[PDB]
Structure formats: structure tokens, C-alpha cells
């Protein structure tokens, strides 16, 4: 997270850390007790998922859980076309027990509103080029479809939306993939991609447009 | 230069 600040501890209790061999590679978002949503580009054959964290070290975080997961369901049309449909559902080996620090978040049924200021959180790169110790939070502004298309054509697709690009250089960056973008208190997007480098004025990042996938998500959960 | 925000980034321009 570029130009954010420490999240209030446990204020984003749906945040999931995706780690393997003890190193973070993406985040995800708890959307039901047994289900973590993440970007499809974060797919691996198995996962160790950290829930209830603030720092990434579970042994330093009361109430946290490191849950195993082997099964994930990529959206079947992920990357067809390229970068589109960037979501997957990770099935935890067992349901979590939701608590004060581990909680699912409702997914937006309505699509992003241009100009909305939405919160993004993660343990990805900071403005100073380092990785944070604790979860970072920043707000970014949803950009119109018209501008998103101009920047990202011909790969722009309605499974995507743009946010950020402000003079403030607030953005998500490497390590933030798969984590949440929250508008109106609902999960609106997942961190997906951008033009390198992160934080360019006038070049918003791109997020998975979850309002397009609520049916697919629940179909997967119920099947 | 369209890169995902994973570690490492997956870069597709």
C-alpha cells in the first residue's frame, strides 16, 4: 500500500494473508466462514492462510489462525481475455470460527460509483520500497469507465474497474493482490493489476469488479 | 507493463 498508514488493529477482520514457505505472496478476503476470495493470478496448488492478523507473525497475534487450504476454484474464464475475470475462491480445509478479529464481509451487489472513496488494505510494498510490519490502509477514488478504458484498452473489460491515480499517489502495490477494496462498507473489488510503477499520478490501478460475480461466487459456495 | 500486484508480479506493455 503506497501512501497509506497502519490500519486500526483488527478493523479489517476479513483480511487474509496468503503465504507459502513463510512468505506472503498475496492477500485474500474472507467472504464466508469456509471461503476466501482472492485474485485468480494468486492461484497456487495449496495455501497457508493467515486470518486475524495485524503483523504477519501469527505467534504474535492473539486470536489469529493459520489455516490450510488445498482446493481453490478459479473463475473458469480467468485470463480469457487477458487479465479479465481475475478471481478465485479458496476453500479452507475447515470453516473458521468467526470472532472479534476474524469475520466475513458482504460483497457489493451494486457496481462501483465513479468518485467513490474506497478503502484498500494490505501488506504490500510501501512508498519507501519496503514491506510493512503491520496491515496498511489507504483510500482511493473510483474512476469512470471512460477513463479506465482509455488507459487500459484493449485489455479493459467489464470484469475490471479502476481506482486511484490521484495527485496523492495513493495506490495498492506488490503484495497487495487479492486483498479488498471496500466501498460503502461492502467488498467492491479485489486488488488485481496496474501499470508499473504503482502510485503514478493519473494512472489508477485496476480491481476485480465483484458486482459482476456475486452469482458465480454463491453458486460455487453452494455446490 | 501491465503487472499484477503479487509477489512476484506477473507482468503481461
Residue numbers in the entry:
A (entry chain A): 16 to 38, 40 to 67, 69 to 74, 74A, 75 to 125, 127 to 130, 132 to 147, 150 to 186, ...
B (entry chain B): 1 to 12, 14
Can you provide the manuscript's text about this entry?
The kallikrein (KLK) gene family is the largest protease gene cluster in the human genome and encodes 15 serine proteases that have sequence identity varying from 40–80%, with a high degree of structural similarity around the active site1. In order to investigate further both direct and indirect mechanisms of KLK4 inhibition here we describe the structures of KLK4 in complex with SFTI-1, an engineered SFTI-1 variant, and with nickel (KLK4-Ni).
To examine the interaction between KLK4 and inhibitor we determined the X-ray crystal structure of a KLK4-SFTI-1 complex to 1.0 Å resolution. The inhibitor structure is well-resolved except for missing density in the backbone of Pro13 and the side chain of Asp14. The contact β-sheet of SFTI-1 has multiple interactions with the KLK4 active site, including the P1 Lys5 inserting into the S1 pocket of KLK4. SFTI-1 engages in 10 H-bonds and 2 salt bridges with KLK4. The P1 residue Lys5 is the anchor residue since it engages in 4 H-bonds and 2 salt bridges, with its side-chain engaging in 1 out of 5 H-bonds and both salt bridges. Outside of the P4-P2′ residues, Phe12 which contributes 12% of the SFTI-1 buried surface area, induces changes in the conformations of loop IV. SFTI-1 has less buried surface area and fewer interactions with KLK4 than with either trypsin or matriptase.
